[PDB]
């Protein structure tokens with residue numbers, strides 16, 4: 001038996017969420033639909049201009065772990081918070097979902113990471129992230145026994161921003177592969193790919209990463225192309241399995257020369273797209289670690305992702321296992 | 331001119347919100363639909379049993395102030411938080427709504443109040459409140475110029491729980507009445523009325539309170555009766571104006587022998603009833619301080635309350651002024 005189906009590793013963040021008008025993004029020089037890194041001074045400034053907000057536990061990988069647990073899989077998470085009230089919220093929410101989470105805070109300062117997420121009327125989300133205690137995640141936070149005992153270890157491209165997180169990921173890759181497990185990553189954000197293009201390709205080509213998740217813009221950015229077909233051909237050459245999401249157009253799963261296209265589910269409306277890709281990865285990785293076909297992994301991903309975009313907050317509040325059962329994915 | 335339409339005073343609280351099944355309330359001996367006071371130990375215990383949650387600024391009077399500001403009125407608030415992350419969230423949200431909020435935290439311990447609110451499938455809410463820093467609210471927190479310059483000062487019956495808050499309220503009553511203003515209270519919760527029945531009646535009969543808000547159960551509890559008609563007759567005798575809410579059956583406004591019945595909005599589904607009474611008071615007090623008829627005040631209260639019960643969280647995230655305009659309440 002294995003203790004875990006999916007271990008995820010990422011920046012532990014609490015989301016601060018508010019709807020805004022289109023002009024707010026322009027006035028504040030926020031890049032729409034992207035992850036904008038900010039310092040402490042900028043965080044205070046944007047917060048002072050932000051309307052009344054809702055808080056919810058976030059973090060890309062955190063959301064993915066939570067989603068796997070929600071669907072019925074056994075998940076674990078590595079990510080560093082501070083010993084503060086935001087850190088206590090993060091710790092509560094992930095553990096309450098039944099994700100193994102044991103990363104120890106190193107003190108109260110830097111404080112727990114937070115992201116101010118502005119949701120426009122079209123449902124797009126523009127994130128503004130102060131990394132705080134995330135800068136302290138390092139090799140010391142690798143629970144080797146967990147990596148040793150997880151079918152898949154999945155991490156964020158976003159980990160390349162903080163200084164030492166990459167060292168932890170290399171340790172995970174080694175331990176995972178020594179125990180015959182598989183490694184996975186998400187490209188995270190198109191600008192993040194702009195920052196770490198060469199390093200990400202190296203992870204894939206050296207075999208440190210087996211399964212890669214990308215959205216359309218991330219895939220395009222990885223190869224600096226406007227040709228989506230080229231991006232699909234190249235990503236298939238660079239990793240063993242690629243899952244490329246296409247928003248309302250669903251997803252395509254690639255393995256060697258195999259291609260499996262999956263449709264998006266029907267939705268009421270796009271309330272808030274925050275978490276879409278994260279939950280696609282939840283459903284995909286849940287199906288994968290249950291031995292399901294790649295097409296069925298894509299279907300489970302589309303189901304979970306389509307549910308999360310119909311609610312405020314990045315982690316489904318409803319039962320994904322019940323939704324999977326009703327959709328006959330079971 | 332007056333600087334303020336409505337000043338409100340209450341327990342400054344951050345809500346921690348989760349849905350639960352019916353059995354959860356029974357297993358944890360939580361009184362359904364009520365405000366359950368808890369100590370720090372019980373707070374830790376219930377949190378450990380609570381599922382993944384969302385946080386939103388709460389506090390009955392805080393919500394009411396926010397509601398007034400959202401409708402287009404000029405609002406102020408007194409309530410005490412701690413110098414901690416929860417306190418910073420509370421301070422941000424109320425000020426971001428355009429409510430004057432200047433009460434100074436006194437330190438980091440006790441920490442900012444929080445309420446674990448469990449929402450059942452019927453939309454009912456069951457609150458479990460650790461008062462924290464709310465116990466420090468006292469006469470030192472009365473900004474006398476604000477009370478002098480507010481058309482109505484409104485406070486919670488809930489303030490009778492912490493030790494010194496009532497002294498601040500009596501100071502407010504004096505100042506308000508010396509400046510020709512009006513005083514208002516909500517009975518807050520049926521058990522709260524059970525605890526402070528004699529004192530609440532004294533506030534009304536001595537003329538410290540001019541305008542009283544009650545729901546059906548609070549009114550019944552006030553006179554320890556099962557006869558709703560008796561309760562209406564008695565509450566009308568005991569205060570100048572009474573606004574009595576009846577959930578799906580709307581409300582009734584009483585003044586002397588005058589009675590004004592107002593219909594509730596037809597609701598597709600009750601998502602979360604948290605905030606209903608608070609936002610009824612927003613709309614009523616907004617209308618009242620705009621010189622509207624008592625019926626129209628009731629209509630505005632019903633419109634705001636109906637909006638807040640159709641969303642998760644106790645402060646409407648949509649424009650109440652726009653809704654009022656569409657409804658021809660303007």
Ligand SMILES: Nc1ncnc2c1ncn2[C@@H]1O[C@H](COP(=O)(O)OP(=O)(O)O)[C@@H](O)[C@H]1O
Nearest residue numbers: 215245246247248250251264276277302305306
């Ligand atoms: N408008 C939409 N309608 C239906 N499903 C959607 C929509 N947008 C996203 N999804 C679902 O979320 C998945 C990931 O969305 P995408 O926007 O590509 O991800 P990311 O969050 O990584 O940008 C899609 O494969 C799809 O299943």
Ligand SMILES: Nc1ncnc2c1ncn2[C@@H]1O[C@H](COP(=O)(O)OP(=O)(O)O)[C@@H](O)[C@H]1O
Nearest residue numbers: 545575576577578580581594597606607632635
């Ligand atoms: N099921 C419902 N349908 C429509 N309106 C409702 C419903 N429940 C509450 N309301 C609105 O909220 C107001 C106050 O609700 P009530 O349940 O009496 O308040 P409280 O929050 O004080 O218990 C009502 O007067 C009505 O306008």
Ligand SMILES: Nc1ncnc2c1ncn2[C@@H]1O[C@H](CO)[C@@H](O)[C@H]1O
Nearest residue numbers: 011013058059060115129158275314
């Ligand atoms: N730099 C970051 N690293 C990891 N996750 C992030 C970052 N910035 C924002 N997020 C998270 O991305 C999620 C949506 O994919 C949000 O829940 C938010 O917390």
Ligand SMILES: Nc1ncnc2c1ncn2[C@@H]1O[C@H](CO)[C@@H](O)[C@H]1O
Nearest residue numbers: 341343388389390445459488605644
């Ligand atoms: N003891 C209390 N005093 C004042 N407000 C409270 C109390 N307990 C819970 N609340 C608030 O009541 C609101 C709903 O009326 C919630 O937003 C919650 O914060």
Ligand SMILES: [K+]
Nearest residue numbers: 272274308313
């Ligand atoms: K969402």
Ligand SMILES: [K+]
Nearest residue numbers: 602604638643
């Ligand atoms: K609500």
